[PDB]
Symmetry: D2
Subunit: 142 residues, 4 copies
Amino acid sequence: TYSITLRVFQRNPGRGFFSIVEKTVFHYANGGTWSEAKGTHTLTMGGSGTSGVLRFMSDKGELITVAVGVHNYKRWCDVVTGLKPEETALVINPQYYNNGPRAYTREKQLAEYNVTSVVGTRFEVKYTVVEGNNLEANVIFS
Amino acid sequence: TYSITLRVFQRNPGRGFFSIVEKTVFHYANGGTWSEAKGTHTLTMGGSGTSGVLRFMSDKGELITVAVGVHNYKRWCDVVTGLKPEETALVINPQYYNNGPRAYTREKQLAEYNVTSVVGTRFEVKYTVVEGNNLEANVIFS
Amino acid sequence: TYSITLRVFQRNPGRGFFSIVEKTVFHYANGGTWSEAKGTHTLTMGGSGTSGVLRFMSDKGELITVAVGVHNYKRWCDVVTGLKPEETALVINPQYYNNGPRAYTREKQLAEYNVTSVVGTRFEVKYTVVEGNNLEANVIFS
Amino acid sequence: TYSITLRVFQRNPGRGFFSIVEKTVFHYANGGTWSEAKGTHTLTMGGSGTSGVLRFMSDKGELITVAVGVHNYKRWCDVVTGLKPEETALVINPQYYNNGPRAYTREKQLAEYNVTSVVGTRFEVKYTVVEGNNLEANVIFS
Ligand SMILES: CC(=O)N[C@@H]1[C@@H](O[C@@H]2O[C@H](CO)[C@H](O)[C@H](O)[C@H]2O)[C@@H](O)[C@@H](CO)O[C@@H]1O
Ligand SMILES: CC(=O)N[C@@H]1[C@@H](O[C@@H]2O[C@H](CO)[C@H](O)[C@H](O)[C@H]2O)[C@@H](O)[C@@H](CO)O[C@@H]1O
Ligand SMILES: CC(=O)N[C@@H]1[C@@H](O[C@@H]2O[C@H](CO)[C@H](O)[C@H](O)[C@H]2O)[C@@H](O)[C@@H](CO)O[C@@H]1O
Ligand SMILES: CC(=O)N[C@@H]1[C@@H](O[C@@H]2O[C@H](CO)[C@H](O)[C@H](O)[C@H]2O)[C@@H](O)[C@@H](CO)O[C@@H]1O
């Protein structure tokens, strides 16, 4: 099994306050499950080669997704911003597979990624444990 | 908009204790979002014709999904039990659409449904507010 | 240290639906802390001789407390029903100590307790692991 | 009645990550209740003249309390840092009343408060809606 534990940091009240509105798990590698403990979020997966997505909404209406997973035994991440209401995590998560338009991002196996949304919100995923089967990352909103 | 608010009742400790491991929203009708308040769960959707799925896991390892949505202005529900780990909610939710194998169940527009899993766990969805745009249901595990 | 992990089972929608409104920890035995994981609640305490209280409110307005702790190396519990709004858990938890009016209930060291409230709600605390430092109990509202 | 709704912003992973370990409500003004919705926390109180406390623990072991309430129709707040394990919120909340050692801090009726702890964690409470019965504040750990 692989697990990825996420801690969510929100830095700037001027950007609003984000909460989870959806959590998906892709079906490769015997799937996996999201759980919550002590304010953290863990994605537990059956092996290397799958992922899951958290979609967040802010109290100012902004919609963004955070994807984390393991690709060929190395962690990966992505953040997609500027989402329309119909672009749910259920739409987004499969786009990383089957030659979909985000596959290249999974293939990068990034240990960190940073994006600013068109409305001006910074998002970062930064893995703090970057190797092994019990991975850890901070997800930072600003 | 349509909303469906769920209250989860668990009746029989001998069946174990269930917690949410995944939540999806289908992309029709401008999608929608899951939220939590006072121990309840609300699916808020952009109109009639979409749905979302909660997947639960028990502390005894059982995996089941609860689907709720609105079809032609009437509520519907379904429960799928006996799931394998790879049969995530991301796999299940689309099976209600595009002529998938569960579409017929959505089309029934049920206000209640009951199933017992092969391992012996009863599940019921019972709508307590069955009309209008602010729907309410109890989800009962036993 | 001692821990008590609680699983809350709500059985009967006719009683309404309860959520937590307060959680206290008494200061003996170097105090302790509440945490949440996978839908469960754990009170971790620095030794034998302290306790904590969860107060619940139903969506019908009912207020009740559940107390759990360890007294002379044995678990104890209590459920107080029919509470007025001014009788917060901060009022109730100290009543088990300093010769207060509920000390005798702590001294019973009960592994199970059953009480039905003035409005008809049945409450049960039943320890499923009843000995040792890693205690477990089901809290059932029926 | 008065309510105070809190949004918790954790800014700086270098301080570790905090989660709630206790929530108390003082018994004046007919008491009150904590609730959670969309990642936020609301204390609802029966009138002016009471308060509640959230205690937080970081994954580095740091213990701090945040107190919010209404005193003579104006909001107040406090943050106490450097707490020992025996100094639970049940100990701290009453210290603002009955001529206790923190009463003067309640009497200040602060709309903002900033303090840095012995281990270097910055804490700010800043009310964003500072008048009326539906108060709002950001709690920032930095
Ligand atoms: C070892 C690894 O990460 N492999 C990745 C693939 O994962 C495998 O996918 C298959 C289905 O094709 C099956 O579910 C296996 O259990 C799973 O490990 C897959 O994610 C591909 C996608 O391009 O990348 C790797 O090869
Ligand atoms: C009114 C209604 O419930 N219609 C259902 C359909 O929903 C519509 O679906 C389209 C896409 O085809 C679009 O997303 C609309 O916004 C949405 O209302 C759809 O769910 C079908 C599935 O067979 O059933 C109804 O017709
Ligand atoms: C061993 C045990 O459970 N003792 C109980 C007492 O707990 C002790 O209390 C003192 C303070 O007086 C101190 O906090 C110790 O750490 C703690 O173990 C206490 O709960 C009394 C209450 O009557 O019962 C036992 O003696
Ligand atoms: C109006 C107001 O905020 N009054 C504060 C007091 O609150 C009152 O307290 C009494 C009990 O003495 C009772 O519970 C009332 O309902 C409540 O409004 C109290 O907090 C004092 C503390 O010094 O300050 C104000 O007077």
